[PDB]
């Protein structure tokens, strides 16, 4: 099933996770036919540890929609934010 979750990540000065995807992007390893932005890796001692996991789909960040966002715009937005970023993610959950 899926779960929508609000996550606060404090930049120090990075978020400590990697992403793939976006409109115009080269995809992702989770939902390959989906244009979304997905968390691909979370630094184990970084600011997102215990909060984000690979597979999490970013659908909003600091109130900006990440639904069907272009890849470069998504990257640049996440990099432009300062201090805390409030994410909305969609996480798949085991049956």
């Amino acid at each position: 099933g899926s779960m929508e979750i609000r996550v606060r990540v404090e930049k120090d000065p990075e978020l400590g996770f990697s992403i793939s995807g976006g409109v115009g992007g080269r995809g992702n390893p989770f939902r390959p036919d989906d244009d979304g932005i997905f968390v691909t890796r979370v630094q184990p001692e970084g600011p997102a540890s215990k909060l984000l996991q690979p597979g999490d789909k970013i659908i909003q960040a600091n109130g900006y929609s990440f639904i069907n966002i272009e890849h470069g715009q998504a990257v640049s937005l996440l990099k432009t934010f300062q201090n805390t970023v409030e994410l909305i993610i969609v996480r798949e959950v085991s049956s």
Partner: peptide, 9 residues
């Protein structure tokens, strides 16, 4: 196809 290139932020 996706080939594993992700972007750290």
């Amino acid at each position: 196809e996706y080939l594993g290139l992700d972007v750290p932020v």
